[PDB]
Amino acid sequence: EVIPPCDPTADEGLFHICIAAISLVVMLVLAILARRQKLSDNQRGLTGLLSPVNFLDHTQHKGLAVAVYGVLFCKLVGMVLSHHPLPFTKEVANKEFWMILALLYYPTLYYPLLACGTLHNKVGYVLGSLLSWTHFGILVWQKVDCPKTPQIYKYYALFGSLPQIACLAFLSFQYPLLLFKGLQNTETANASEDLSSSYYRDYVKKILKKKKPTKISSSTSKPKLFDRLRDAVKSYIYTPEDVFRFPLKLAISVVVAFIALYQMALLLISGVLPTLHIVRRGVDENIAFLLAGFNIILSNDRQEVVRIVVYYLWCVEICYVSAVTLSCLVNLLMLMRSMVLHRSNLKGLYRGDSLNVFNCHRSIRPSRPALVCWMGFTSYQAAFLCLGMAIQTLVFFICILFAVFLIIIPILWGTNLMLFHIIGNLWPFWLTLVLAALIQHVASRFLFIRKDGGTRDLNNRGSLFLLSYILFLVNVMIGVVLGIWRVVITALFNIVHLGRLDISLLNRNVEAFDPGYRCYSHYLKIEVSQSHPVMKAFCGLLLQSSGQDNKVSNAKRARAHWQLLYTLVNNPSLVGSRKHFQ
Amino acid sequence: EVIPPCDPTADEGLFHICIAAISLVVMLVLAILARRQKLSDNQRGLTGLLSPVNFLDHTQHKGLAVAVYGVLFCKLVGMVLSHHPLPFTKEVANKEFWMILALLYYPTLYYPLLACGTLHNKVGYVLGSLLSWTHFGILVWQKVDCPKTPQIYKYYALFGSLPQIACLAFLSFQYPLLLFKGLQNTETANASEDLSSSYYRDYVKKILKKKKPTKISSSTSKPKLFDRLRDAVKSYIYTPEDVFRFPLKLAISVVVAFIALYQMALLLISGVLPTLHIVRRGVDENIAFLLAGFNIILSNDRQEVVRIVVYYLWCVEICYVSAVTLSCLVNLLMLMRSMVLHRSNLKGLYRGDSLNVFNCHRSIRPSRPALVCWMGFTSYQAAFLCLGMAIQTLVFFICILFAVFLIIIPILWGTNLMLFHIIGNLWPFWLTLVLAALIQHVASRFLFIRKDGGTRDLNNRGSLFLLSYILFLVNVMIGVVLGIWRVVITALFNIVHLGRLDISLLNRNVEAFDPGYRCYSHYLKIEVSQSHPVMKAFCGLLLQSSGQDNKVSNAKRARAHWQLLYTLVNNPSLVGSRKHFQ
Amino acid sequence: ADQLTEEQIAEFKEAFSLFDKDGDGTITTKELGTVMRSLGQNPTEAELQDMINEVDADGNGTIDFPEFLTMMARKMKDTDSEEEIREAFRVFDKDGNGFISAAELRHVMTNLGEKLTDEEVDEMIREADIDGDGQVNYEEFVTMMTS
Amino acid sequence: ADQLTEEQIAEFKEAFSLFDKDGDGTITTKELGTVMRSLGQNPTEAELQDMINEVDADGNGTIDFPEFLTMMARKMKDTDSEEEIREAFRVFDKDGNGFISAAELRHVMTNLGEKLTDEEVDEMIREADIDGDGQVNYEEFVTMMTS
Numbered sequence A, B: 001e002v003i004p005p006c007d008p009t010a011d012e013g014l015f016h017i018c019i020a021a022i023s024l025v026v027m028l029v030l031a032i033l034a035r036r037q038k039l040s041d042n043q044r045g046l047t048g049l050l051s052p053v054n055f056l057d058h059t060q061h062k063g064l065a066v067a068v069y070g071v072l073f074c075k076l077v078g079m080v081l082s083h084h085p086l087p088f089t090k091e092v093a094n095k096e097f098w099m100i101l102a103l104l105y106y107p108t109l110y111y112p113l114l115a116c117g118t119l120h121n122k123v124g125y126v127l128g129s130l131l132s133w134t135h136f137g138i139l140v141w142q143k144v145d146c147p148k149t150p151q152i153y154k155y156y157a158l159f160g161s162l163p164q165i166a167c168l169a170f171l172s173f174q175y176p177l178l179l180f181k182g183l184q185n186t187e188t189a190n191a192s193e194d195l196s197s198s199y200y201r202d203y204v205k206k207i208l209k210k211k212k213p214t215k216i217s218s219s220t221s222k223p224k225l226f227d228r229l230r231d232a233v234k235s236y237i238y239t240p241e242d243v244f245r246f247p248l249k250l251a252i253s254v255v256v257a258f259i260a261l262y263q264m265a266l267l268l269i270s271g272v273l274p275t276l277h278i279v280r281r282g283v284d285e286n287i288a289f290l291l292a293g294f295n296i297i298l299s300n301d302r303q304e305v306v307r308i309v310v311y312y313l314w315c316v317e318i319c320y321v322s323a324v325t326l327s328c329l330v331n332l333l334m335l336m337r338s339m340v341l342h343r344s345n346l347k348g349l350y351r352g353d354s355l356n357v358f359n360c361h362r363s364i365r366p367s368r369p370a371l372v373c374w375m376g377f378t379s380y381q382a383a384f385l386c387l388g389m390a391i392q393t394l395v396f397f398i399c400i401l402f403a404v405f406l407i408i409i410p411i412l413w414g415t416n417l418m419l420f421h422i423i424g425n426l427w428p429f430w431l432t433l434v435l436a437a438l439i440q441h442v443a444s445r446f447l448f449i450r451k452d453g454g455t456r457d458l459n460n461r462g463s464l465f466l467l468s469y470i471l472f473l474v475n476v477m478i479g480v481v482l483g484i485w486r487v488v489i490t491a492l493f494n495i496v497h498l499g500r501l502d503i504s505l506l507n508r509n510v511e512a513f514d515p516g517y518r519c520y521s522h523y524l525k526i527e528v529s530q531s532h533p534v535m536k537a538f539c540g541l542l543l544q545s546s547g548q549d550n551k552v553s554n555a556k557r558a559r560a561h562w563q564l565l566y567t568l569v570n571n572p573s574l575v576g577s578r579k580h581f582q
Numbered sequence C, D: 001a002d003q004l005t006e007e008q009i010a011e012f013k014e015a016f017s018l019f020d021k022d023g024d025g026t027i028t029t030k031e032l033g034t035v036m037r038s039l040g041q042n043p044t045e046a047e048l049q050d051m052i053n054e055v056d057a058d059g060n061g062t063i064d065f066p067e068f069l070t071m072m073a074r075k076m077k078d079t080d081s082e083e084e085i086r087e088a089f090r091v092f093d094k095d096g097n098g099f100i101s102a103a104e105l106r107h108v109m110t111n112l113g114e115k116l117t118d119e120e121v122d123e124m125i126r127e128a129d130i131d132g133d134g135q136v137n138y139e140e141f142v143t144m145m146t147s
């Protein structure tokens, strides 16, 4: 009902031209410095441009990369809603084709932001800060004026840009903050990615020292239903004190999922309630009378029908709000749960142990299609969550109206009693499914099963073969109640765990065809074959001792020959695997 | 449109009185003979009545028990359809309560049929044959007159009783056939259930002799797409030459499932096509014109609308026939597949091996709720299949109209083109999901992955971290196509394998809450703890040698001491488990 | 009684477990008489004390697992694997002369416990003296494995 | 360098496998120089030939898995487990006198191969002779495990 003209939008067509002129310069400046520093693998193996931040480091600071992907995802959200958004200076060429290259446009535009972190010098952060000042400057100035927008909702683009604002603010408090750390000569250090931190050393230290905390304590005891409120804490515990740091590609995928949860929860609320209050206002009771009289019965008092139809459109709005707040809470509970399970999956794949040994009994081998699944694991995580919030809300919406219109209202008020004329006409029938299932459990523990010496339980036969024959046609009617439970409990479990990748929804025997669990294993297999935290700590002792260091070395060898013996005495089974492998 | 009066039905109220007078006598005759034979566990441990045929024998002849359960299931099918069927001489007492004790009535009525097989004498088969003559006599005579019945269909009760007729005919060719075998003095033998057949002896023989066929042959080679028509034969092969016989309770459950498949396939066809031909005849084109003119557009030629609406009600009948013949074929394919997998699950549980060791690593212990799942496993198998044919047909019906009304008709005729105005308006869009997924597979195998000596493949880094960043927003749009595939492939797999018990539909980590797989493991656990085919062959050497058999026995001991040595020489690891367990 | 794989021993390990509910690894009389009752028969307690005596060779009244293995190993075997008894001779004879002394016998019991008294060892060889010599033939060990 | 469980050795078995692509169980120079290149650095080939020489004690130019284990076992250990070196003394000393001879030393190499020549065995004990005696103290074995 309001339309703002915008001097920012009239300049946004030139801010498309301005910023893309800035981003093209800084990329080619970094092409000059790479021909002035004799860099490692960080150069492009096809042209020579810089790589962005190294993904196969576990000790690298992950504030920049989580920030930039958190911005690049939000521009995808706004791009779907606005139909037009980039016709601006290029040809359309069958306009739906022009809604494609914008997928390749935003990562090109934000590319010099990540590119500064790979150098750690006075050049990078000065160029890095001013760009993060600029994008934070343009967005905030666009939203101070014109908050009300006629696209979707009266406040939508303001609330739609709340992650994208605050995530650029993290770039503004990091590039000057890390430039200020250059006073301590943190720019004379180099891009050695195996820089022996305390993390790599303490992780090997945790393996060998472990024998002294291996001595266990006692066990505690908690009573009923508070341990049940404590075993749920045991699934909450993502915390525990550990020398363990995530991969970079996995750490991005949790936050980018968390932004995607925020965007679907806003799109569902602010797309439905506008078309509900309008009906709640514009009731047209004179017209809804003829809408009633053409199909159904007035049933009394056409004035009171205003009280009637409103008293149901309360409950449609109450249901659809409760459906989103249920579905948003569950996926919030799952990504927290998906955080602790990435920890235990990844330590168990260090050992080659018997946890994920359904495929870890085979060879670690970085094949071709293992690598494509790694290229773009973060996108799969945030894509399966947006479909999660769609289906879960569409299901729970129909699962609460079935409760509200059938058991909640009649216990509250008592208008319609449709189920209690069904269950009230089967009240002797469901007794016999109980009593026969009662007589099978009761007669088993007290007559057939005979606990004996050693608590070993045998059976009093003969009479049992009869009882499993009298109850034959009864147990078919129990077999229908378990039949609908198998269908239900598979439905709930397929939707709750629908937005997770670490878990396969199919059978044990056919896990490899579920495409979600397929791309997660091939991620986690190539992550351990490249950056294992023991061989990356091992080269630290061979590098930082080499750069900082006869019969005298034979005395070192005389210690070395004894330390070979001191290991083999306390480790017997290695002696065969020494002599067969010497 | 026809109504038969029935002199059988007017006598069926007395045939209810007649047969129940016969069945009560023969049960109490067997109570007298059990006080004249000093029987084993076959007596009731609460009253003293006979047990029916022993279920925990693997060598007992399974023609009787499969026949009687095949009759007892069919009476359940007819009992649901007729609302009234037993008001006849007893009180109604809230009539829906009177539709309950009939579940306990038919196994009481057919009880002396199974009870004859547990004696093997001249008394049993003479009494057994005449009863099987009688029930076969009454049913056939009821169906010679009055085939046409106004209940459901013109031929329904004739086609509805085709298993129940022919399964009593097996009782008529078994009780006189086994009575005729009593000429060879097969009634002087006893009810020793461990009767050492060739089965128990050859099964132990297959274990020890196995070392001489353990020498393997070569391997064959077959080209493409005929091996694909041969690996499907490898799932068909239920055949192979083996000394292996099913449990009795498992062997019943396949046939009773096969009858239940026949009954749902008849109820769906003969309940829907009557209400379809009537509309195909009684079209009322003058009335359907006003049915058309009140909602939609005539669009031409109200005479030709007769050709129009008929040309769609061809396809509704063609779809619903094809949906049943698809769903009947799949469950036919699954129970054949469920037959071979019961073989391999059960041999692998003899070993305690590493196949079903998700629970076989724990203790074999016949607990209380393990026994209830065994009591009535056959009912669960035939209950989950009737729900299988319901849902599978309801789903496939909606999955073919989506094909027939959208791709089949327009390629055939070309009236409506609803999808090819959707896909025709995205023809450049889906190219880029291909080309980016093309460029990830192509550039990986030819630039990054470097096969080296020893076929060990490493990667040319640096350039790859860039490519997994340019393609970030593209891979979200690939992540939606895999998102709907995860939802689809879980749906198909949940319906195809819905009528199986040997397979858990939930995750690996939560199999134990699926109630179908729960009752199958607790079956198969108590089946091996009672009748293992090695300890049941072991007591055969201790029984049939005891009833048919100093320094001379010390010479037998001098052979026995040497045979202890001959085993321990060729089996080294048992020596510790001999001396620690002597 | 020959060499077996892990699986072929794993089943006999399993079926042995269905007798001894103790987990101790041995079968008493009452640990046996319940199973015979479960398959129908009611044997005489004096007969069951005789029925263990065929299986038990150590005479301790209880049945070990290799005592359980040899009972099923005797009577369901093939006729002969002539090389494997010839393969057995390389352990029972250090000499290679084919003649197994009582001193060459006690070398094997030295490897495997030497559980029995030497008089009972002397009573073993008195069976194998149909050769007319008092010395174990190549065939004496063979006929003991056949019957 | 102390006693470990199966899991604690299983990881070092795994990280060793990421070097030797042969599966042979040993690391050459070119089997090493590819991994150092993969983490960025370009070492001198003469330096890499020196870098193996710290690890390899047998002097065959190649690295064994217990040769790989001791490198990580030295420098990330705790200060001392005083009982376990005292637990080690029961194998290195039959006498219980605490004094480890060259004859008591070669008993252990007899158990574990006796891979080295006796002159090189003689060059071992010449390190432990700061006691002023030519005899291994209780503490001589201790200081060799610390540094």
Ligand SMILES: CC(C)CCC[C@@H](C)[C@H]1CC[C@H]2[C@@H]3CC=C4C[C@@H](O)CC[C@]4(C)[C@H]3CC[C@]12C
Pocket (backbone or CB within 6 Å): A391, A394, A395, A398, A490, A491, A494, A495, B487, B488, B490, B491
């Ligand atoms: C509870 C259900 C059966 C009620 C039906 C809901 C409606 C919306 C239909 C339409 C599409 C259907 C969904 C599509 C496919 C799946 C994925 C499967 O892994 C779980 C069931 C689930 C999620 C279906 C449930 C039922 C469904 C959601």
Ligand SMILES: CC(C)CCC[C@@H](C)[C@H]1CC[C@H]2[C@@H]3CC=C4C[C@@H](O)CC[C@]4(C)[C@H]3CC[C@]12C
Pocket (backbone or CB within 6 Å): A487, A488, A490, A491, B391, B394, B395, B398, B490, B491, B494, B495
């Ligand atoms: C293919 C589907 C989604 C189309 C929807 C079909 C209609 C009939 C709805 C109504 C009830 C729904 C079914 C009920 C529950 C289940 C069990 C689940 O383990 C697989 C999906 C399945 C079988 C649903 C599929 C969709 C469904 C069949």
Ligand SMILES: [Ca+2]
Pocket (backbone or CB within 6 Å): C020, C021, C022, C023, C024, C025, C026, C027, C028, C031
């Ligand atoms: Ca015992």
Ligand SMILES: [Ca+2]
Pocket (backbone or CB within 6 Å): C056, C057, C058, C059, C060, C061, C062, C063, C064, C067
């Ligand atoms: Ca014994």
Ligand SMILES: [Ca+2]
Pocket (backbone or CB within 6 Å): C093, C094, C095, C096, C097, C098, C099, C100, C101, C104
């Ligand atoms: Ca000799």
Ligand SMILES: [Ca+2]
Pocket (backbone or CB within 6 Å): C128, C129, C130, C131, C132, C133, C134, C135, C136, C137, C140
């Ligand atoms: Ca002789």
Ligand SMILES: [Ca+2]
Pocket (backbone or CB within 6 Å): D020, D021, D022, D023, D024, D025, D026, D027, D028, D031
């Ligand atoms: Ca090698």
Ligand SMILES: [Ca+2]
Pocket (backbone or CB within 6 Å): D056, D057, D058, D059, D060, D061, D062, D063, D064, D067
């Ligand atoms: Ca070496």
Ligand SMILES: [Ca+2]
Pocket (backbone or CB within 6 Å): D093, D094, D095, D096, D097, D098, D099, D100, D101, D104
């Ligand atoms: Ca000494």
Ligand SMILES: [Ca+2]
Pocket (backbone or CB within 6 Å): D128, D129, D130, D131, D132, D133, D134, D135, D136, D137, D140
């Ligand atoms: Ca000294």
